[PDB]
């Protein structure tokens, strides 16, 4: 046909991914920043006992 | 896609794909162009 | 042993509450001690040291193996043109016409001779498996299982409270991977497909595509 | 167009994961009021 | 005898303070039936005592004990009755060749 | 309670007379839903679909 | 006999130097057979006696239950599948698994249901065997006998030690016969009573040597 | 050399670090290879040396008995079957199992006769080995001597310690070659000399990797 499309306007794809690299973008960027948060979780407090939130 | 490959899809599968904007390619059949039988034909799905 | 929740007398055990007293030589000292020695194979405290240093090597190879068996089939499902994306067919890539292409790419590794692969492997593994026994360039006198130094460049084993915690994570990730790599073995023998294909076949219909689909498969006569 | 879509999905998920893990990084303790 | 827990730790008879004494379950909750309106002869000395006697059929703990021998036999026959009525009808309806598992016509099924 | 309440709709559609299917062949009427879709790729495909 | 040093042995009369030192004869079934030295540590030899007796009590339940569905099929009871290594697959049958032949009985259809019920039920009673449960808490790990000897047969400890030897010798035979049933099904392909019937029919040709060229690698 | 710490190791220079401490070098064939730890109990370890040597001696009679009917069929001697893993089927042939090819020889017909002979014969000799009897009573079960050393070579323990090392290393080659012969018969289906000859035809193409795709699963 005349031009080139991505062809996903009304297809209902999961999180709008149609190249599998887009799903690894979703997992890579979430996973990179989950890991930065997880390693940095030692500076956030060890809320280990049961009554250890901001409560009233 | 051929004509039968289009008609073997439901409406929600062909929707939003751009397949609906295309003519069916004629994958079977040859370029001999003579075994077309002479005479009149009413021409649908043109 | 510290108050690290995974060590000592009040530690989690392999039957939960139904385990009773653990064996007397499983004092909660070494990581992953769920008190599971029902066969009594490690009652000798010297064989128990050998089985510990044999479990963890099995664990570290199976953790590499389980990641190494999912990863070419996961990318193979996403259009990467492997010769055989399935792991138990991945050996036969050396026997096809173009040889063995890493990532299915012809101008990557491009192995053609399997005798060159094995001849390289025996020389390279034999050098480094012996380094694991004694000495070596990356560390000479270290622990047999947790050498550190050059094998801990990020320093993630400095705090011995953290280090005794991460050893529990290593053995539980390892025992899960050994138990899953055994799953890769059996469910490739029984079914004949890749483990990510067995997963997606199970997800498409869990009522029929469970393991009872192949229960009559090895029936005699 | 796909190069733009990959880039926007790296960018948007960078800022969404800043949002989510920011409130998981002990937001309710970042008060001036002591208890 | 030493009775370890069915699922987990220590089991057996944890509390009989729901069945005997002033504190116990009743046939009406405590905001509708206090502990002074219990009849004086219904105390926490018999099993299954809920303070239930609105029609004054109990008089004293010796008359209640001789209705207790009427209650517990009527219990133990109806428990054998309830299993004897459902199970043969259930087997016949699912395929057994009982021919009369329904309880109210078993007698006339076997006459001559 | 919400889970067992959600099974009331499933039991009423599968067993207790069925529910109204407006897409039924022959026009819309009450249809016992003998084959409910338990495929996770279809069920969780609505949730990750764009709005 | 069966205990002390002056007991029966695994080589009989030619066994006076064959038996090791630690196999004294204070445990039942001790004919002094540890030819590979596996049970030299008494901590592991304690574990292997638990492994032997529980295997014995599962094989006696095995060898009786791998046989009585095939005898009653010779007596005229229809099971669907009476041969033991085909009797698991009859839950996938068109009417499911009726117990003997009655659809008024168990009539199971779902294999994942009867397995998950088993994992919950057997996960508790094998846990009761280890730590204790409703039938006892601090008994012998192999011989509880409080709720598990209701008929009083664990009395008179002189003849009760004989019953421990009668237990393991019946049990070792059943373990030796369950190892039978597994191999006589893989090799033959027929039921063990069917293996019995044709050897009683013609003992000359219907033996294991008629199947000796079955596992030949022909390539 | 061959005893004490002067012995050579199973990993060469890499085993100078850690051998098992109980493997001191006071037994023949000790290269310090117990990475699994199966012999830290010396009562278990004395039973494993008995298992290793009897496995070694049966493999030496095995690897010679598997290699001799093939090397004699290559000369031109007519055999019923040259290869060892099809060598039991000759008793089910027409003329039975002739020894080389002749009829004044053994001429085996019944498998039940030749097995029940062996069962009572090896029942006596193996029980005599475990206990003692008509060829020695208080002798060493590992190395008896006397009637089991007729040629007078079990003397002068400086050269008898070396014959112990020559005993087990020839055996450890033979056990590795029977498990050699076992695997190459299953994977290929041809004899070991028949596997030796076509590896000498084209060594690059005909090796073990040519059969690597054989046991693949595909359903
Ligand atoms: C209180 C309940 C409880 C129960 C019942 C169990 C039970 C078990 N845990 Mg434990 N756990 C429990 C609580 C807990 N566990 C753990 C932590 C662990 C760990 C880390 C591990 C275990 C493991 C085990 C297993 C150990 C022994 C074994 O392999 O059984 C042997 C017997 C069976 C498995 C029964 C067989 C099942 C099935 C019914 C048979 C199926 C039949 C087939 C069709 C036959 C096949 C056909 C043939 C022809 C091929 C066992 C399944 C280990 C494991 O997973 O190994 C497998 C293990 O590594 N548990 C924790 C956290 C502290 C608990 C918390 O309360
Ligand atoms: C981790 C060790 C390892 C394992 C488990 C395998 C497994 C396999 N390789 Mg293999 N390889 C391994 C290392 C190596 N291979 C190769 C080179 C090849 C080639 C060229 C080929 C194979 C093939 C195969 C498969 C044969 C099909 C089969 O037998 O189905 C039955 C078995 C299974 C389905 C899996 C069961 C695994 C196994 C029985 C249990 C694992 C425990 C082992 C007993 C331990 C053995 C390892 C020892 C030596 C340390 C099989 C899955 C062939 C193939 O891909 O065919 C399709 C093939 O052509 N491999 C090299 C380079 C020299 C290796 C280096 O170490
Ligand atoms: C000389 C180079 C040298 C090379 C190429 C290797 C290679 C390897 N070693 Mg080895 N080693 C080497 C020296 C030595 N190792 C060891 C002791 C060990 C142990 C105990 C283990 C290894 C393991 C490994 C593997 C994973 C390495 C890793 O964990 O990366 C991660 C670190 C940075 C990326 C890899 C095959 C592991 C293994 O084989 O499990 C699969 C393992 O457990 N090595 C010692 C004694 C201190 C050495 C001395 O120089
Ligand atoms: C004690 C409890 C009891 C109850 C509730 C019934 C109930 C009944 N019986 Mg009965 N029976 C009972 C005891 C007995 N019955 C019988 C023998 C019979 C016969 C032969 C018949 C009944 C019948 C009946 C029905 C009469 C109306 C009714 C369903 C009649 C019936 O079933 O008609 C439908 C009937 O023909 N019963 C015997 C044996 C002596 C009994 C023993 O105690
Ligand atoms: C002096 C005569 C005498 C002999 C020789 C034996 C010998 C034996 N008794 Mg003993 N007993 C004897 C007297 C007595 N026993 C006992 C009481 C017992 C008991 C309770 C038990 C034994 C058992 C055993 C066996 C233990 C060793 C074994 O398992 O090897 C087995 C292996 C072999 C013998 C070698 C291989 C078998 C065969 C000859 C070769 C066949 C080769 C195949 C064709 C190979 C093909 C397959 C391929 C694929 C590999 C062994 C056969 C145990 C047993 O039953 O074990 C099975 C046992 O439980 N005995 C009493 C009563 C006091 C005796 C008194 O006379
Ligand atoms: C088309 C597909 C589209 C994409 C899919 C879209 C749907 C995805 C939805 C998935 C579900 C998301 C839910 C995540 C919940 C996270 C909640 C959380 O904050 O979770 C918080 C918890 C915190 O855990 C606890 O964290 C603690 C922190 O300890 C630290 O601090 C302690 C003191 O506080 C001690 O000092 C300790 O030593 C120190 O380590 C401890 O370590 C505990 O052991 C630990 O259990 O995290 C945990 O439990 C585990 C968290 C879950 C696992 C996260 C995995 C992330 C992805 C991995 C894969 C990445 C791939 C990368 C690819 C690279 C190549 C491109
Ligand atoms: C237990 C560990 C283990 C083992 C034994 C294997 C074994 C195998 N893998 Mg797997 N794998 C594993 C773990 C493992 N893997 C893990 C953990 C991962 C995730 C990262 C992978 C990911 C993976 C992929 C993606 C692929 C394999 C492939 C293979 C096969 C070929 C091996 C090969 O090419 O090596 C040689 C590999 C290397 C030396 C490392 C990669 C080097 C690349 C080519 C980059 C080159 C480096 C540098 C940038 C360029 C140098 C330039 C040069 C001129 C100097 C073989 C079956 C290939 C295959 O076809 O299998 C189906 C394949 O494509 N593996
Ligand atoms: C969410 C609802 C809820 C909750 C948590 C409670 C909780 C309680 N009530 Mg209240 N109550 C409720 C609803 C509720 N009630 C309603 C609807 C009524 C009117 C019938 C009452 C009338 C009532 C009285 C009159 C008394 C209590 C009392 C009590 C206390 C315990 C005794 C007891 O079991 O109640 C007794 C109530 C029952 C036995 C009713 C039967 C309930 C069973 C479990 C069947 C439930 C069916 C189903 C699960 C729920 C309906 C399904 C659907 C329609 C939603 C306890 C604090 C007592 C108290 O506080 O003493 C000081 C007391 O005297 N309640
Ligand atoms: C105040 C509340 C307002 C009311 C909210 C009611 C609920 C609305 C949200 C729920 C429905 C959407 C579910 C997820 C849908 C989805 O994945 O979108 C997926 C879509 C799909 O995107 C498109 O998909 C198409 C295929 O259908 C094509 O592939 C297109 O190329 C692709 O762009 O992406 C978006 O529309 C944008 C999402 C990113 C923006 C999110 C902002 C988050 C802010 C922080 C949140 C922290 C938590
Ligand atoms: C504890 C106890 C106790 C009591 O008392 C007794 C008893 C019971 C005995 C015990 C138990 C034990 C157990 C469980 C065991 C198991 C193990 C295992 C499974 C391992 C694995 C193990 C496993 C392993 C190592 C594995 C490894 C793997 C690997 C490397 C892989 C590789 C690969 C890859 C990558 C890919 C390609 O393509 C192919 C291959 C080549 C294939």
From Swiss-Prot, chain A:
Intracellular or extracellular location(s): Plastid, Chloroplast thylakoid membrane
Stromal side: 41-56
Transmembrane feature ranges: 20-40
Positions on the Lumenal, thylakoid side per record topology: 1-19
Family per similarity comment: Belongs to the psbW family.
Protein function: Stabilizes dimeric photosystem II (PSII). In its absence there is a reduction of monomeric PSII.
Oligomeric and partner information: Part of the photosystem II complex. PSII is composed of 1 copy each of membrane proteins PsbA, PsbB, PsbC, PsbD, numerous small proteins, at least 3 peripheral proteins of the oxygen-evolving complex and a large number of cofactors. It forms dimeric complexes.
Record's protein name: Photosystem II reaction center W protein, chloroplastic
Species, as recorded: Chlamydomonas reinhardtii (Chlamydomonas smithii)
Residues of the full protein shown: 60 to 115 of 115
Curated annotation (Swiss-Prot), chain B:
UniProt subcellular location: Plastid, Chloroplast thylakoid membrane
Tree of life domain: Eukaryota
Known function: Stabilizes the manganese cluster which is the primary site of water splitting.
Family according to the record: Belongs to the PsbO family.
Name of the featured protein: Oxygen-evolving enhancer protein 1, chloroplastic
Provenance organism: Chlamydomonas reinhardtii
Source species taxonomy: Eukaryota, Viridiplantae, Chlorophyta, core chlorophytes, Chlorophyceae
UniProtKB/Swiss-Prot annotation, chain D:
TM annotation in the entry: 4-24
Source species, domain of life: Eukaryota
Alphabetical UniProt keywords: Chloroplast, Membrane, Photosynthesis, Photosystem II, Plastid, Reaction center, Thylakoid, Transmembrane, Transmembrane helix
Entry-linked Pfam families: PsbI
Effect of inactivating the gene: Able to grow photoautotrophically only in dim light, oxygen evolution is 10-20% of wild-type, reduced accumulation of protein D1 (PsbA).
Subcellular location, principal: plastid
Localization of this protein: Plastid, Chloroplast thylakoid membrane
Entry's Gene Ontology BP terms: photosynthesis
Keyword Transmembrane helix among UniProt keywords: yes
Cellular component terms per the entry's GO annotation: chloroplast thylakoid membrane; photosystem II reaction center
Bilayer topology term: Single-pass membrane protein
Subunit structure comment from the entry: PSII is composed of 1 copy each of membrane proteins PsbA, PsbB, PsbC, PsbD, PsbE, PsbF, PsbH, PsbI, PsbJ, PsbK, PsbL, PsbM, PsbT, PsbX, PsbY, PsbZ, Psb30/Ycf12, at least 3 peripheral proteins of the oxygen-evolving complex and a large number of cofactors. It forms dimeric complexes.
Family: Belongs to the PsbI family.
Role this protein plays: One of the components of the core complex of photosystem II (PSII), required for its stability and/or assembly. PSII is a light-driven water:plastoquinone oxidoreductase that uses light energy to abstract electrons from H(2)O, generating O(2) and a proton gradient subsequently used for ATP formation. It consists of a core antenna complex that captures photons, and an electron transfer chain that converts photonic excitation into a charge separation.
Classification via HAMAP family: PSII_PsbI (MF_01316)
Swiss-Prot record, chain F:
Transmembrane segments: 12-34
Quaternary state and interactors: PSII is composed of 1 copy each of membrane proteins PsbA, PsbB, PsbC, PsbD, PsbE, PsbF, PsbH, PsbI, PsbJ, PsbK, PsbL, PsbM, PsbT, PsbX, PsbY, PsbZ, Psb30/Ycf12, at least 3 peripheral proteins of the oxygen-evolving complex and a large number of cofactors. It forms dimeric complexes.
Entry protein name: Photosystem II CP43 reaction center protein
Whole-protein coverage range: 155 to 205 of 461
Job description of the protein: One of the components of the core complex of photosystem II (PSII). It binds chlorophyll and helps catalyze the primary light-induced photochemical processes of PSII. PSII is a light-driven water:plastoquinone oxidoreductase, using light energy to abstract electrons from H(2)O, generating O(2) and a proton gradient subsequently used for ATP formation.
Origin: domain of life: Eukaryota
Compartments where found: Plastid, Chloroplast thylakoid membrane
Post-translational modification: Phosphorylated in vitro.
Family: Belongs to the PsbB/PsbC family. PsbC subfamily.
Gene: psbC
């Amino acid at each position: 046909l005349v031009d080139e499309r991505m062809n996903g306007d009304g297809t209902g794809r999961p999180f709008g991914v149609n190249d599998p690299v887009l799903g690894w973008v979703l997992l890579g960027v979430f996973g990179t920043m989950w890991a930065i948060w997880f390693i940095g979780q030692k500076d956030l407090g060890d809320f280990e006992d049961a009554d250890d939130g901001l409560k009233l | 896609l051929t004509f039968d490959e289009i008609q073997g899809l439901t409406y929600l599968q062909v929707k939003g794909s751009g397949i609906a904007n295309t003519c069916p390619v004629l994958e079977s059949g040859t370029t001999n162009l003579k075994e077309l039988k002479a005479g009149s034909y009413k021409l649908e799905n043109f | 042993t510290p108050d690290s929740f995974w060590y000592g007398p009040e530690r989690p055990l392999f039957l939960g509450a139904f385990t009773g007293e653990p064996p007397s030589y499983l004092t909660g000292e070494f990581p992953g001690d769920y008190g599971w020695d029902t066969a009594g194979l490690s009652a000798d405290p010297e064989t128990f040291k050998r089985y510990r240093e044999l479990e963890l090597i099995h664990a570290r190879w199976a953790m590499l193996g389980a990641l190494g068996c999912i990863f070419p089939e996961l990318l193979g499902s996403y259009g990467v043109p492997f010769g055989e994306a399935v792991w138990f067919k991945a050996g036969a890539q050396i026997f096809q016409e173009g040889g063995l292409d890493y990532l299915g790419n012809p101008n990557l590794v491009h192995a053609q001779s399997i005798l060159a692969i094995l001849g390289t492997q025996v020389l390279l593994m034999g050098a480094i498996e012996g380094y694991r026994v004694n000495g070596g360039p990356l560390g000479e006198g270290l622990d047999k299982l947790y050498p550190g130094g050059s094998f801990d460049p990020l320093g993630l084993a400095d705090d011995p409270d953290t280090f005794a915690e991460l050893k529990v994570k290593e053995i539980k990730n390892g025992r899960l991977a050994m138990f899953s790599m055994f799953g890769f073995f059996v469910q490739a023998i029984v079914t004949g497909k890749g483990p990510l294909q067995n997963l997606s076949d199970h997800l498409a219909n869990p009522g029929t595509n469970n393991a009872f689909a192949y229960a009559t498969k090895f029936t005699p006569q | 167009m796909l190069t733009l879509k990959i880039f926007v999905y790296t960018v948007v998920t960078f800022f969404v994961c800043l949002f989510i893990f920011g409130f998981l990084s002990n937001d309710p303790a970042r008060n001036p009021g002591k208890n | 005898k030493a009775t370890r827990g069915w699922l987990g730790g220590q089991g057996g008879a944890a509390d009989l303070d729901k069945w005997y004494g002033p504190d116990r379950k009743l046939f009406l909750p405590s905001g509708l039936y206090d502990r002074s309106e219990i009849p004086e002869y219904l105390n926490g000395e018999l099993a299954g005592d809920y303070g239930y006697d609105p029609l004054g059929l109990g008089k004293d703990p010796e008359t209640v004990a001789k209705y207790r021998e009427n209650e517990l036999l009527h219990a133990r026959w109806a428990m054998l009755a309830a299993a004897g009525i459902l199970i043969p009808e259930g087997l016949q309806a699912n395929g057994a060749n009982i021919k009369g598992g329904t309880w109210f016509e078993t007698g006339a099924e076997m006459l001559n | 309670m919400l889970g067992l309440g959600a099974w009331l709709l499933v039991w009423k559609a599968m067993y207790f007379g069925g529910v109204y299917d407006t897409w039924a062949p022959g026009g819309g009427d009450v249809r016992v839903i003998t084959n409910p879709t338990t495929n996770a790729a279809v069920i969780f495909g609505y949730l990750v679909k764009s709005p």
